[model samples]
Target: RFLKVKNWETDVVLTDTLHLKSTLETGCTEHICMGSIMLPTKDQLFPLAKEFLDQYYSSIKRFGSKAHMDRLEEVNKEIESTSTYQLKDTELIYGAKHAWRNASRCVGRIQWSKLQVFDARDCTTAHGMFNYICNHVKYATNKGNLRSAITIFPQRTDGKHDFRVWNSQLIRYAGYKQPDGSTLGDPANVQFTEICIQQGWKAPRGRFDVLPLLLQANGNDPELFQIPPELVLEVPIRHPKFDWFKDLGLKWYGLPAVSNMLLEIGGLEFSACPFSGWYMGTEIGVRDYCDNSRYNILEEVAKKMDLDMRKTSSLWKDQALVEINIAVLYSFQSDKVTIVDHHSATESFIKHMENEYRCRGGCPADWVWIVPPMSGSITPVFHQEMLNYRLTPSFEYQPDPWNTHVW
Candidate 1:
């Protein structure tokens, strides 16, 4: 029996300490209040006074200020007017279902846009598509379950600099179409290209149209150079003995053994080239394979040789000779080709031609002989004519049939 005194709102009495003492002593059920004590009737007392104080103290501690208390009072009044607290509680129970439906459109739009970009050939556009797909994949798979996904539109649109050029190029290619079905050139695309030109990506075209253009774009914009996740899925595993020319029994220049022998020779030449940069510290004698100077030289030589081959040979007619030339150039155009420990420089050069180039339809030996020497071997041997003479005789004559060919 707790007591509430009349006209004293702050006072309270615990029944266990007061009236219950006599009950415990006498095992009695009844107790009486002392005279002059003014007790309120149950109807006059506040039912939740103690609970209210506990909540109020907790709120003050959590919010840490009188301003928060004022805000809480304002919120309570609003809640009372609208009965919003009950409505909010009900919403919490079904919020996830609502979220799932709302999320579908966003996911579908992102997926469609990403797939469209992936199919694009332009490196700049393709790069953007790859990034978009990677981001969405991460989003969809986050927490081992599908969740809400976010698409962040790039803030900057200028394509002049390395960072913006490829992304802008991608946007340019993903053209805009009006409701009337007319394709409209995007002003943003124009603006982005202008920015890219300012940043020095001065390619003749904004979109990468060729392999060289794609390579240049990738070089300029590293962000656009990421390999796609799908490439892993598309790669074909080749058996060790699988020959591109022979395993399929392809016809070659009136000789059944030509393709098989040529492929074997090419593989041997490539293996013997001594250019193992990835696996450094191995027994291979090639030095500094990853060195920028070496890489640049290799890239330049390969590009020039490829261009030359394409110009000289009709398509599908000179493929064997092209393969031989590529192998010869790959082996000869290296700094390690003349390195002292690999004293088999001339012999190795000859062997690469004999085994690989000759077995394939064979390249002009004079071309092989004309390969530039390293700085260390800058003797009279570097003279272009002497090297040419050494290689010409081998191709011109078989066992001194040298009279047939002349340099």
Candidate 2:
């Protein structure tokens, strides 16, 4: 049994032997109930379910009042039948939209209502789920026109087993470790890439090689589906001012869709919801390339540009970062892919704030993520204060699929 001395309110909270690997290997499953106080109890959740369903019934009203009233009566009986409630077509759409609106981490909630939701609850096999998600990737990509969409699969019914998406993204780079202890492609996905190889997925031979979609149904071993080359759209990173920078061999996928998130709507959890949005340039240029643990391309870029990296006073890293951002922005724009620069995206959040104030009274945002990484204070959102809290009918972060497996 684990011990909780309850004195961490003022302790350092670490022992000398507590290195990351050791702690991780300890297999300590956390029972985090800190948010339990804020969460609605089982009794409270029942009314919230009814209230959302009532609104949904009113929203989906069509035909004459007699028809609507008859449908509402039947819906009321369905609601009364069990503690769990299934969202209808319109309700599912609304829940998705509101879930985006209620997504505290997203800076792109302004288009929450425009999300094209595909209901694929009947899908039971991994192959079936792959086809649905494949369509999701294609339609959302829109040949770089980049429409936002979410494809929701089955929900937990009788608590038998869970459906899961094993891939972190619908498309991602395959990481390969060279003989010199250097990594090619995205270092972030290295573990997943190795796992895929061990599971019989082929390893591609390039730095920015794209990987296939991996899916699991009823907690089965993940099956991989090779995404058609034509369906995958890539933006070739090139700086508008620098012609030679295009030779860097840097490229990014058109859509940034993630499949591993759990969709919790009105207390019912749907684990295999894949959603996409157009990129923000800083998401590529700053974090992905510059983050030390990931690609770590800033030093290379600086050296390539002949910048004075010997001195931090020269702002060599900053100069390289701007060029990187410029390349991403120019590349996406050149490809006619919909992408937002940090400045424009930050401004959009301000506009999102104003619209939310008028439409929904108050907006919730995670300010740390909302502020653009490139330049914060110059943006109006930098001065703005925001609140973050858990809201139901929301998309939530879940552990990686492999993390919980019995392997």
Candidate 3:
């Protein structure tokens, strides 16, 4: 006899102190007290929580400019100065800072009237706050400049403003490419598609081009899509995992060490110096001196080894090799090709030596250990950029909105 299984529950709910605090604080309609209950120690959370918070806070101080920076700094200092609390007040302050920074960035791009109403609403319900901000609030009200709103809060188009497109664009410019030669599309597009399909929209398009139509039809209605709170929470949380954060810690998260590292790396001053351009030659220099030079060298070398050197008299092979060198040098001096081209020519000569002498039975067994002359000439040529410099900027400032702001 076989027992039948009706359904499988894959849902996982994490019950930690932070989760408990969030739940209790949200659920409480009146005050009640239990004896000093077994609250989990800060260590029970990730060891890096404080570090994350510190970095986040510092980032806020920097990006938000002097006024907000001063307030955030004061709260940070207060938390640092105090030592009486069970959990570091810094942790709470950092959490508040994180939430505020995210909320402020979101609100800053919103219309004043919408912001006032959104702020007045109790943002205690994570879902409610997210729905109100992302769906209910028009990133650009009918009265405001849609272009400017999107320029500042790009994800405002889809209400998932988390700097994802910013991060992806950085990654793309850093040299990764898709099969079709395009960089990853905007994260707002990704979020929009997910939202569209979830709401039973037929064949949701994963791009901003369709967003204005969706918004125009829906009139910024939150009920149009069943956006989950988990999705909303993912925005700010996801920002720290961005490549930007990997290299530079969140400035507002309160982790000075991590934040400093992030700053150093993001600023291209870290120990590893990931973004240093010292080794890469200027683009103009590469274009003039190396790119074509390398190509010419490869072509010349290919010609010499494939045609001239191989077909020359066997008895005067060494002399033929010398003549070929002279011709290559003349080509370089005549400006017929670049040093890169000469290098390629040399490389082809070397390959000829390798193929004809080393790999083939042409060379004596005793001389097999040593590379032949032509083969020794080949050297791999690479652009200075490939050898030394990072392909793109370490930090990407937000993009200006496209003209017309259709999305």
Candidate 4:
């Protein structure tokens, strides 16, 4: 039997043929899918190291050259004597880019090859790590013209010397729980904010208080350092037509640096490789502002628009959501900060998918995440049939640093 689906955006019917391989599963069942779960890690490092060496040499069109063979022998000898091998600076840079290319969930893979890899494996203390992070923020922010970059810390050695950043994102607003049970800032960061407080950070209790960095080096206790306000580039939200929107007093950081995800290349795991890219407009406007569990500004915005909130048929929520998205795009554009609309982003992803398929035969994707939140079927990706699977040299989510006991 053939599985067929129609692409509403493209006006084409796509069909899945017979199983390419019997054991290949896309992590989906008839009733539910587990596409978001982390892939299993391998125990043997040498085998993966050899494979990565082969990949590295082949990438440069020198698969069996003398230098390539010598490098492999050197890596094998190192592993045999020390149980771990080091990646050359060039190899590490290539691997970091490949990991970005292999990341299945990110919508911005079109810029994978253009990533700036910052090697911070020599960091020996939380204070030093904080300095490197500030440098990363300065480079990535670039006065609002955000650049894609990753700062890779020391690799995990027997889980003893794993460097980690406790913050989910390098830049995030602090949240505080009030006496009336209301949230004061970004609700998603409430627990982290509490952790910051427990670590002796003075709570500002402001709506957009930028949280301090929690840096852990060599499996030690994390230390907190406040980010310099001058280094952060923030955009104030203001609508193109709605003058009342500014009264909401909203803003967001230009950079979206994710610091908690694990970077796995070959078999080596870098526990603290913080990477960032510019934002897609809806990431802030749709999810940050409108998600019920987040800022939840829909009702307030609708009230300003004079939409009847009590009636479902008024489409008040939809109208406000669209305007909020527009305002995010407008504000970022007006401030000279790089941001993409959902339409442009999804179209670019479609192009990236085609490129990946031509280069790598397949592109792993999480369908639920690939589709835009506001306009699902309206985007080309929503109608595209995608396969979800693990790829090597990938970025995977690890358990929170608090739960993992090495310190």
Candidate 5:
């Protein structure tokens, strides 16, 4: 049995060594972790298709049942003739939910069972994708009460006719490069904004101008579509105690819909499956606003607080960070927009781990990400050593569509 001596207050506690697989040969290891990279997309789907069918049947306790056996035979025959097979609607839902359940990076998996999977796999045109995307945005935003959801587009077939959404996120601010080389809006999106402009979008050149959607269907050039202003729900950031915080004129979208990640089920790869969930306060307050690289609003927020900007000893940034995060929580709550504070989110994650351990023996976690960026040590997850491993039916990063498309 694995054992450890620990002072919960100070010592670096060691967890079970069984979690570390020296011989397993997975992406993550003691010295190196390639967990951030995309899961290798399979060329032959029949084997994985059969394997996932086994998982699907076993999950429902119907393994080896006539229906399960027939499904295997049907998929086998289809692949033999057409070289690929389609998943039934029920199978699709199960795979989608399992994919969410197997998403190791997400601390919000406690809500995995609650996901609303939108099957837009029938969509055949860029315009059709935009209409479906609009519906997803509206349904997910739910007028500020956000819901966890995914809109699955057609799966990759022949590698030449892949459908994809070009935006990293469904809603994000555009960044315009000024004459002096400084970015005017969200610097994180500067490259994407450049691409949007290249695709014939006339930039309005505003700080918080919402970028348009870029949709690619059947491997054609991506088409641009403007999200209706009424459909884009945004909440203005305002502090409960600091009135000047509101004067910053900062705002964020209600839905955190990730559009670029590939959704892999069995061996099937969906090049464009946009999934969304409600934001955690720190996602906006820490990374989006104060991440020096993104909005870089920390120094400004500190300056507004009249904190000593010259001295790190003053802990100006620390105090400002807390206030900004608090403002994010308060603003979203007051606006009737859904948001969870770091503390509540991490607490729920603790419950999620417990549930996962009881159900699956162990849960894969990326400690660096699972721990909140702010007040990390104080969060329970920081103290808990986690195993990081790949699981099938997962969301994965894919190469940019532009990078692969023939020009």
Candidate 6:
């Protein structure tokens, strides 16, 4: 169950959430109806119906078959009268992977087609979402081996209700603001931790505390549900050759499960599709722990490495970055957790590009993201020319429930 996925959009600062909405193009199709905010036109359902039919035929490899006509008629009737249509179990499973492959910022799309789909669309209560979240966390965590999985709830047929997992992930660390203008734990999760606190969720001493999954059922206020502590798998980072690095006490969740992105297939948007995948080392080594806006551990690592901080040309910063990345890869390897180093990851991605080119004739990628942050020049993807664009039956970021709540 420990499978994972990543996301796009929102700079993630408290200050930027508001400004980014208008400026950022969501790349989602226009909404037919948004939670009673609007109503669907007859024209709106046709493309979606056709999209589903085309995929349905392609999936079962039965286009123009007699059963195809029967299924087509059934879908046409179902979609025209009702805004929502049912997806076959196989279709649902493949659609999830298709969405993942269509994700713009996921450098790990080479594994996109292998995503495990948990069909919990029958889940109808906040408590139901809770139980599913616990199962997703446990199954995907896979006792440190890690597995990528996504549990999907029902879609918003007409915006009257949207089933959603509100937390960024089924498991995430918390941040607590200290009395002396300091912070503890993951800074990226600080605002979310505060939201949990304000909502009366109790936390422990809060040093790397795993945040509970927040499930919002049918536009209802989000509800918090905890994963049993034993289910979470974390790898404590250590240097391959340095003992002092162990003293830093840095650790990261075994799987990176993103719960925020929208999964769009056949014009139906499942806003609660929380997808997980194994981590690329740099995701934790560079962005989460080393980004200036996040954990920002470069200075400490530099000091530990005994490099001179006084001179810019000393390359202390660069040296520390490599050390941290090595520690992350080493720690994950030592722990037997699923992880990919940047070089190996890009190589796999290049193979994926070749696969997609042979099959789909074109593969799109964002060069800035495709290139690893620490060694942009050396990786094979660095020199590659990518044709990036938007496509349907994809995954994209949407406004968080908190942002658009009618409080």
Give lDDT per model, in order: 0.24, 0.76, 0.24, 0.87, 0.85, 0.76
- The local lDDT score (0 to 100) that residue 22 gets in candidate 4 is 20
TM-score of 3: 0.19
Candidate 5 residue-wise lDDT, 211-328, digit = tens:
9999999899899999999999999999999988889999998899999998888788888999999998999999999987789889899989998988899999999999999999
What would the per-residue lDDT of candidate 6 be over residues 334-404, giving only the tens digit for each residue?
99988999999988887786676556544556666678888986887776666455555677777777887
Task: Put down candidate 3 lDDT per residue, 1-407, tens digits, no spaces.
Answer: 21111111212121112111111121122484322222212232222333443454554555455644554455445444542112233332333222322221121111211211112112222234334434422332221112111111111112222112111111110111246654232332344444444545554232112221122111123223323322211001112112222121111100000000111111121110001000011111222112332111223333434444444464344442343344333333343222223344434433432332333212111111121224332323111000011111121223222211234
* Candidate 2 collision pairs: none
| Cα lDDT of model 1 by residue, 292-361, tens digit | 3221123333343344444444432233323323332233233122111222343333343333223322
Q: Which pairs, if any, clash in model 1?
A: 159-192, 159-196, 160-195, 160-196, 397-401
Alpha carbon deviation, residue 27, candidate 2 (Å): 23
Deviation from native of the Cα of residue 270 in model 5, angstroms:
0.5
TM-score of every prediction relative to native: 0.17, 0.84, 0.19, 0.92, 0.93, 0.87
The Cα error of candidate 1 at residue 162, in Å, is: 22
After superposing candidate 4, which stretches have Cα over 4 Å from the reference? 1-8, 11-32, 36-43
After TM-score superposition, what is the CA distance of residue 264 in candidate 2 from its true location, in Å?
Answer: 1.0
Best-first order by lDDT: 4, 5, 6, 2, 3, 1
Pairs that collide, model 5: none
* Number of clashes recorded per candidate: 5, 0, 36, 0, 0, 17
Q: Predict model 5's lDDT versus the native.
A: 0.85
Ten contiguous residues minimizing lDDT sum, candidate 5: 16-25
- Indicate the residue-level lDDT of 396 in model 4: 78
